[PDB]
Structures are given as structure tokens and as C-alpha cells.
Amino acid sequence: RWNAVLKLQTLPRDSSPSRQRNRCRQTGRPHGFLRKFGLSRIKVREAAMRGEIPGLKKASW
């Protein structure tokens, strides 16, 4: 380690990637979030079935 530099922890601790949750962008839910749409699963489904999301469809593989 080194001198005064390690002691510089006067930061807000809102800097850290440990801090922000990644809540659902529409509803604030902090569970069920896939990053690709950035939404929790239910609003993904609600949108997708109503045909708005481009190029998205059912899978039968």
C-alpha cells in the first residue's frame, strides 16, 4: 500500500459499482431484471406480446 493516497476514502461511496442496484426502469422492481431490455420480466412480457419490441418473437427450438 502507499502513504496518504489509501487514506483518500472521503468519497461518497456512491462512486462504487457495489452501490447502484439496476432497478426496473419502468416500475422500480429490484428483482427479475434482465439487462438486455433493462426492465423486470413482467413489463418485458407485457410489451413483447403486444408487438411493440422490434424483431422479438416466440421460441420453439
Binding site: 438486455k36 413482467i42 421460441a59
Partner: protein, 98 residues
């Protein structure tokens, strides 16, 4: 040489853009390789349906990512610009590198 790798939701759509690059190229100059097919990317998802509980049944989703690659080995530099730009590329994304 100069090449276009395309990307599309519809296979029958990227098909029309790679039709248009061919018939544009042999019109304006020459020397196009047409659509090299290239393997399909398939973004397969599965997510839980219910608002609450009920883990058991879930719904699967897919986004088919169709690629195409077109190259021009064309040395006719002053008709390459005429081949360039003017196309709208069937309303779906295209990238044109040297």
C-alpha cells in the same frame, strides 16, 4: 476488399438489400461477390410469467439475428461512390468497411 456486413430481423429483407447492392454494382460498375450467408445468431431467452410465485411454467423468446456479408473487389473507384450512399438498405442496419 470493400465490404458490407449487414444485420437483420428478417431473412427475406436483408435478401432485398443484398439484391439491391448486386444490381446497383453491376449497373454502376462491376465486381461484387453477392451475399455470403454466414451462421445465424439466435438470442434465446426464458423468463418467468407470473407477477408472484408459480416458478414452474415460463415463456421462451427468441430474436433471430440474420447476418449477410457482401464484398466488392471493384477497382472502379469513381463509380464506387455512386454505389455508395444512395441506397437506403431496406430499412435495416448495414455497415460498410474498407
Amino acid at each position: 476488399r470493400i465490404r458490407i456486413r449487414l444485420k437483420a430481423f428478417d431473412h427475406r429483407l436483408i435478401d432485398q438489400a443484398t439484391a439491391e447492392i448486386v444490381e446497383t454494382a453491376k449497373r454502376t460498375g462491376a465486381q461484387v461477390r453477392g451475399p455470403i450467408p454466414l451462421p445465424t445468431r439466435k438470442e434465446r431467452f426464458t423468463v418467468l410469467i407470473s407477477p408472484h410465485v408459480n416458478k414452474d411454467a415460463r415463456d421462451q423468446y427468441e430474436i433471430r439475428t440474420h447476418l449477410r456479408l457482401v464484398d466488392i473487389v471493384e477497382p472502379t473507384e469513381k463509380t464506387v461512390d455512386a454505389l455508395m450512399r444512395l441506397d437506403l438498405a431496406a430499412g435495416v442496419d448495414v455497415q460498410i468497411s474498407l
